[PDB]
């Protein structure tokens, strides 16, 4: 698209469509308000007794 | 006029299945021996509380 009489730096542009899932970092902004889940994947390699 | 809103809580740790401490109160304590006896020529041993 071309917008006609217009300067650049008093426009805005992001891109908004996705197909894929992130993890929600606490370095990431929302959102939205209230979040919607996806899904969830488990944390390998637990605790075990042995001897030293 | 931007705001941020932040938020957090506590929950327990799942390793407290394998490390911990425990503290119990104490009451009156049970007694028992063990015994060695040389009888009619041999030994014998007995249990008892
Ligand atoms: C061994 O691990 C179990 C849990 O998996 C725990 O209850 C127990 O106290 C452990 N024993 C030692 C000696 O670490
Ligand atoms: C068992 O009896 C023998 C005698 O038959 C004795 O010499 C020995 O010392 C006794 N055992 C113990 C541990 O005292």
Do not use: M
Request: proline share 4%; aromatic share 6%; hydrophobic share 35%.
């Amino acid at each position: 698209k071309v917008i006609n009489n217009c300067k650049i730096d008093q426009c805005h542009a992001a891109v908004t469509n996705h197909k894929n899932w992130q993890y929600n970092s606490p370095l990431v902004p929302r959102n939205a308000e209230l979040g919607d889940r996806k899904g969830k994947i488990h944390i390998p390699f637990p605790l075990a007794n042995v001897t030293c | 006029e931007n705001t941020q809103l932040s938020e957090a809580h506590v929950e327990k740790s799942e390793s407290c299945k394998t490390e911990f401490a425990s503290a119990y109160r104490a009451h009156t304590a049970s007694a028992s021996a063990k015994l060695r006896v040389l009888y009619q020529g041999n030994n014998i041993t007995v249990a008892a509380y």
